[PDB]
């Protein structure tokens, strides 16, 4: 898997590949790893499929009731703490990383890391097996003040670059743009991926 | 370690970081991993320090006598086969990767990979623990027809990008430009390294 989130002025862009594997076998080649936790709050799934889906199901439930009690959309910090606490309490039994990003009236567009029960805000963040091969790329390619389109292009290029190199990553790139107005869903097909040196 | 070689019209550019570690301990922080095998042939060392130095010592010896018998500078293919054969015969006991690059009257500037006794010619090649984090970068940044200076910046940028991310890589960058005219040796200090996003 290769997951990625990028903050911009009015919100966030989140991306993921589409490969679900079981050893060297592709089980699902078109999985959408960008799972909604609330209207305007999403998480990118990685690691154990069963663990990631379980944590997402519980976080969306906790956040739904939290939102209805505060008579307000939950804060992205609250959604990040929700996921983080589950990942931390069960870190010995869970083997999943759920990146949390979205939008708020208070702090606007924010990107969070939940790796092993930790919590960290990032201008952009990457995860999954595929992220290992694009650290140098994202370090060279990231520039602050990127537009939502520039964020989608940074996310698409970085994920395609990882998809080529990583056996556990491939398929299609799913893009999601969370903003005050709402959420936009894009899909970049395996035919339409950006091309780079592949020999 | 992060090693790298790039072919160009009149020859090759080879680079390496300078870290020599023993666990989490830096043993020598300014070691030159670009070892000459002949006048216009060099190899970039990675993996076990004892194994890499042993193979280089033997390859330079075998190539010196080979060159004197043919009354000619050895071909870079001959030097690549020399290193490859040692790495292959002793692959169960050796844990080093020696990239081989240089120049010839015949085939000109060539870059070879020797990983585990295999042999492959590459337009450019990377190695060592640090290479893992710059695959996506070199895949995006490499363009054919690069000048020797463009090869040197490409090699400098890719090695600095890996040095920052890799704990087993660091120090200065040693650059070497092998051409018909001769060999040029450069050292990019830890103070003069190119800067990218490092947070």
């Amino acid at each position: 898997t290769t997951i990625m989130a990028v903050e911009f002025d009015g919100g966030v862009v989140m991306g993921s590949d589409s490969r679900v594997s079981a050893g060297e076998a592709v089980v699902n080649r078109v999985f959408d790893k960008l799972s909604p936790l609330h209207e305007r709050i999403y998480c990118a799934l990685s690691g154990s499929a069963a663990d990631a889906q379980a944590v997402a199901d519980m976080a969306a439930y906790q956040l739904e009731l939290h939102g209805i009690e505060l008579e307000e959309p939950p804060l992205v910090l609250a959604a990040a703490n929700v996921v983080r606490n589950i990942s931390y309490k069960y870190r010995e039994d869970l083997s999943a990383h759920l990146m949390v990003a979205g939008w708020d009236q208070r702090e606007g567009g924010q990107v969070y890391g939940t790796l092993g029960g930790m919590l960290t805000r990032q201008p952009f963040a990457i995860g999954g097996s595929g992220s290992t091969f694009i650290y140098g790329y994202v370090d060279a390619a990231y520039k602050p003040g990127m537009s939502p389109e520039e964020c989608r292009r940074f996310t698409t290029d970085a994920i395609a670059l990882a998809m080529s190199r990583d056996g556990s990553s491939g398929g299609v790139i799913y893009l999601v743009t969370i903003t005050a107005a709402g959420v936009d869903h894009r899909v970049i097909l395996g035919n339409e991926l950006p091309k780079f040196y592949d020999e | 370690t992060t090693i790298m070689a790039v072919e160009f019209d009149g020859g090759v550019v080879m680079g390496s970081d300078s870290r020599v570690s023993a666990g989490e301990a830096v043993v020598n922080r300014v070691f030159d991993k670009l070892s000459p095998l002949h006048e216009r042939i060099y190899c970039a060392l990675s993996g076990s320090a004892a194994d890499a130095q042993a193979v280089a010592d033997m390859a330079a010896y075998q190539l010196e006598l080979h060159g004197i018998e043919l009354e000619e500078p050895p071909l870079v293919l001959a030097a690549a086969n020399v290193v490859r054969n040692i790495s292959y015969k002793y692959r169960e006991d050796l844990s080093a990767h020696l990239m081989v690059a240089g120049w010839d009257q015949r085939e000109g500037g060539q870059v070879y990979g020797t990983l585990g006794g295999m042999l492959t010619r590459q337009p450019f090649a990377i190695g060592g623990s640090g290479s893992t984090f710059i695959y996506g970068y070199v895949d995006a940044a490499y363009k054919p027809g690069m000048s020797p200076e463009e090869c040197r910046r490409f090699t400098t940028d890719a090695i600095a990008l890996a040095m920052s991310r890799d704990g087993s890589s660091g120090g200065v960058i040693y650059l070497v430009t092998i051409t018909a005219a001769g060999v040029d040796h450069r050292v990019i200090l830890g103070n003069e390294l190119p800067k990218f996003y490092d947070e």
Binding site: - | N28, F31, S48, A49, A50, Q53, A54
Partner: protein, 220 residues
């Protein structure tokens, strides 16, 4: 062990402690870790004491045969290569970690040789269980082209930091200065611990020990 090397304006300084430990017990309070290889080549040994002793003895003996045949002063590159090729052959089972320092026709040189047979040419180095305490002092205060006494002082401080900070190191600081004109073996150059004094009243009056048998063999 805390063994250390330095390259100054007119040569090389080699430092060593005097502790030999046998599993948390100090066996020797003053052993010699700086060994002769050739008149202007010395070597510090750290690790398995028999392995450091014998690999240093063998290369010194090989360098005597080298110099006798060539008729020239030995080169420090030769001792480095003879040592590496021997250690590599033994796959790290010969546990000698060495600091080779010396002066030949090409100037002063300092090398670190590890048990598996890897080496590096360094301006300063430290090996042994206390190498990090010495390497901190060297990194903190090394400047190139130092004077004889500035280097001697820095080296003493580097070995002393290891003597005090490493449980596997102690005793005195032994040192060796090597210059174009030869080597000065400064044994017990520094003693970070002043002579330990007790009020020892452990005299036994003759006869206290009960003897069962006594045979006396006169000699000549």
């Amino acid at each position: 062990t805390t063994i250390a090397g330095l390259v100054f304006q007119d040569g090389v300084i080699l430092g060593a402690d005097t502790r030999a430990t046998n599993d948390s017990v100090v066996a020797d309070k003053s052993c010699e870790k700086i060994h002769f290889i050739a008149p202007k080549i010395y070597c510090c040994g750290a690790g398995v004491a028999a392995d450091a002793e014998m690999t240093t003895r063998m290369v010194a003996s090989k360098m005597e045969l080298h110099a006798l045949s060539t008729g020239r002063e030995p080169r420090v590159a030769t001792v480095t290569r003879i040592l590496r090729q021997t250690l590599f052959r033994y796959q790290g089972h010969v546990g000698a970690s060495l600091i080779v320092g010396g002066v030949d026709l090409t100037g002063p040189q300092l090398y670190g040789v590890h048990p598996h047979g890897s080496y590096s040419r360094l301006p300063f180095t430290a090996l042994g269980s206390g190498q990090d305490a010495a390497l901190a002092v060297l990194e903190d205060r090394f400047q190139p082209n130092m004077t004889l006494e500035a280097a001697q002082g820095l080296l003493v401080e580097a070995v002393t930091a290891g003597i005090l900070g490493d449980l596997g190191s102690g005793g005195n600081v032994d040192a060796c200065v090597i210059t174009k004109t030869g080597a000065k073996l400064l044994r017990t150059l520094s003693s970070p611990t002043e002579p330990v004094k007790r009020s020892g009243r452990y005299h036994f009056v003759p006869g206290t020990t009960a003897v069962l048998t006594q045979t006396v063999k006169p000699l000549t």
